[PDB]
Design a protein around this ligand. Structure first.
Ligand code: HEM
Length: 154
């Protein structure tokens, strides 16, 4: 797939608003993910034990990780499709060390779209959501292909 420059503009316009508070958007997205699909939380030896949303909000460790994740995703989106290099180390660790199925990447995509919708309704109308969905589908397809090359394709 290939996004047009107008679609990347819609994606990087909302992302510029997310960057005003990377730690708060990280926390909202990871919590939405763990709450909606609790099986994803098991993948984290570090956070598994958290029982409620209040516990999740108070974890400084979970908030730091959410900044790591959003920074890595932000550097991929700013490449506008030319992300081959950034994707390599990400795909290798998530397919070999953490073992994350493609279906869990769909679950966090949904979580990102839910939080942008709530926090940025003015900059995330239908056309901008369609461009963000296209940018994440592109990311998942390129990661799926690398998984296969690495021997996991999950
Ligand atoms: C937006 C998609 C995602 C991005 C950009 C991302 C990014 C990262 C980054 C940068 C790290 C640190 C370095 C690394 O180990 O490679 C990380 C670690 C990790 N990721 Fe992801 N990730 C994504 C999706 C997920 C999902 C959906 C799961 C599981 C449901 C997952 C599970 C893990 C685990 C278990 C670690 C290790 C955390 C720790 O103990 O250090 N990732 N991720």
């Amino acid at each position: 797939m290939v996004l047009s420059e107008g679609e990347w503009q819609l994606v990087l316009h909302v992302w510029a608003k997310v960057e005003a508070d990377v730690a708060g958007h990280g926390q909202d997205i990871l919590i939405r993910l763990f709450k909606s699909h609790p099986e994803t939380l098991e993948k984290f030896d570090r956070f598994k034990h958290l029982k409620t949303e209040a516990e999740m909000k108070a974890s400084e460790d979970l908030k730091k990780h959410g900044v790591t994740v959003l920074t890595a995703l932000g550097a991929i989106l700013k490449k506008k499709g030319h992300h081959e290099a950034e994707l390599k180390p990400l795909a290798q660790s998530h397919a070999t060390k953490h073992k994350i199925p493609i279906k869990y990447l769909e679950f966090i995509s949904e979580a990102i779209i839910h939080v942008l919708h709530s926090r940025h309704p003015g900059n995330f109308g239908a056309d901008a959501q369609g461009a963000m969905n296209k940018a994440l589908e592109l990311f998942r397809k390129d990661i799926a292909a690398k998984y296969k090359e690495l021997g996991y394709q999950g």
